Ligand SMILES: CCOc1cc(OC)ccc1C1=N[C@@H](c2ccc(Br)cc2)[C@@H](c2ccc(Br)cc2)N1C(=O)N1CCN(CCO)CC1
Ligand SMILES: CCOc1cc(OC)ccc1C1=N[C@@H](c2ccc(Br)cc2)[C@@H](c2ccc(Br)cc2)N1C(=O)N1CCN(CCO)CC1
Ligand SMILES: CCOc1cc(OC)ccc1C1=N[C@@H](c2ccc(Br)cc2)[C@@H](c2ccc(Br)cc2)N1C(=O)N1CCN(CCO)CC1
Ligand SMILES: CCOc1cc(OC)ccc1C1=N[C@@H](c2ccc(Br)cc2)[C@@H](c2ccc(Br)cc2)N1C(=O)N1CCN(CCO)CC1
């Protein structure tokens with residue numbers, strides 16, 4: 001049980017999909033992020049592993065137009081930058 | 086910020102010297118244990134780096150009668166078992 | 171409470187971390203030196219117990235490129251060379 005504290009904007013994001021805490025485990029962070037992408041359909045209708053986030057609050061936070069769910073380190077890094085760490 | 090959550094006993098120990106939260110960074114955890122040990126003089130006054138936790142809550146929580154503050158890995162481990170981690 | 175007087179060099183250093191006295195108590199100093207090192211990020215990233223001070227005033231004061239926080243007398247010996255009396 002290793003918790004993290006998301007910054008104001010990220011916490012706003014997680015909370016838009018049901019999150020209710022201030023600190024979370026990374027597992028929870030990724031879960032909520034996953035749900036958010038799926039819910040707002042930021043993934044490519046054709047190939048679901050490609051995420052197109054430009055034009056969304058998510059794009060702002062990750063600072064990239066798109067990314068692959070395979071790029072784990074890149075993903076951990078983009079989340080990192082959004083952590084009161 | 087990387088937070089951990091102390092089990093009830095460790096949490097009493099921590100709060101017995103001033104702690105006021107439920108989750109802490111390991112830096113804050115070790116800071117407090119430091120104070121607890123100093124405030125109760127569990128350290129050997131003839132070798133200040135040796136800690137004798139025998140017959141003390143810290144001893145029941147760490148499962149050792151003594152240890153050196155130089156055994157970092159050992160200390161992180163004894164602390165791990167007292168974490169809802 | 172045995173107050174101590176840090177030479178000009180070291181005295182100026184402690185100050186940089188928000189210290190306000192010409193004399194302190196070892197417990198106070200070490201706490202600050204620890205703060206200096208940490209936030210200054212002078213420790214090996216995969217072994218926080220290793221301190222790389224070269225390329226820093228601290229290395230000057232101690233006269234060492236690096237050292238381990240486990241080297242206790244050495245850290246005392248080094249601070250005793252930075253103290254009046
Ligand atoms: C948004 C679509 O994401 C996927 C697409 C895939 O296409 C084949 C396969 C796996 C995923 C997927 N992997 C998950 C994940 C978790 C942590 C890290 Br680090 C990386 C990836 C996790 C995820 C979490 C956060 C972020 Br950011 C990106 C991906 N995650 C998911 O969100 N999904 C939703 C889509 N489905 C399809 C179900 O058949 C699989 C799981
Ligand atoms: C999300 C996966 O994270 C891990 C996976 C690991 O697999 C080898 C090992 C360690 C971690 C881990 N390291 C933590 C961390 C904290 C600060 C910085 Br700077 C860097 C890393 C911290 C972390 C924090 C932010 C980010 Br981004 C990535 C990792 N963090 C975790 O969240 N962990 C470690 C503990 N475990 C379960 C152990 O019983 C869950 C995952
Ligand atoms: C209780 C005895 O404490 C010491 C005695 C020493 O003898 C020379 C040297 C260092 C310490 C000391 N080191 C600190 C520490 C922090 C993290 C890890 Br992991 C290990 C050690 C930290 C500590 C924290 C938690 C735990 Br468990 C053990 C040690 N801690 C302290 O509590 N200190 C700092 C050093 N001095 C200054 C006055 O003599 C005594 C108090
Ligand atoms: C005390 C320092 O610990 C680290 C030092 C590192 O060196 C770079 C890297 C990662 C960590 C680190 N790993 C985390 C962790 C959590 C669960 C498990 Br199971 C294993 C490891 C978790 C941890 C939890 C409990 C215990 Br016991 C030991 C480590 N955790 C941390 O405590 N931290 C705090 C310090 N930061 C960087 C601060 O600038 C990194 C993460």
Ligand SMILES: CCOc1cc(OC)ccc1C1=N[C@@H](c2ccc(Br)cc2)[C@@H](c2ccc(Br)cc2)N1C(=O)N1CCN(CCO)CC1
Pocket residue numbers: 111112115157200201203204205207208213217218219220239240241242243245246
């Ligand atoms: C800056 C990192 O320092 C450490 C790294 C360690 O790595 C495992 C373990 C213990 C310490 C540590 N020991 C403390 C200390 C106090 C008096 C003397 Br004599 C020697 C050491 C004291 C210190 C004081 C002055 C100087 Br010089 C060097 C170290 N002190 C600290 O500064 N810290 C701060 C960081 N934390 C992380 C815990 O998760 C541990 C304790």
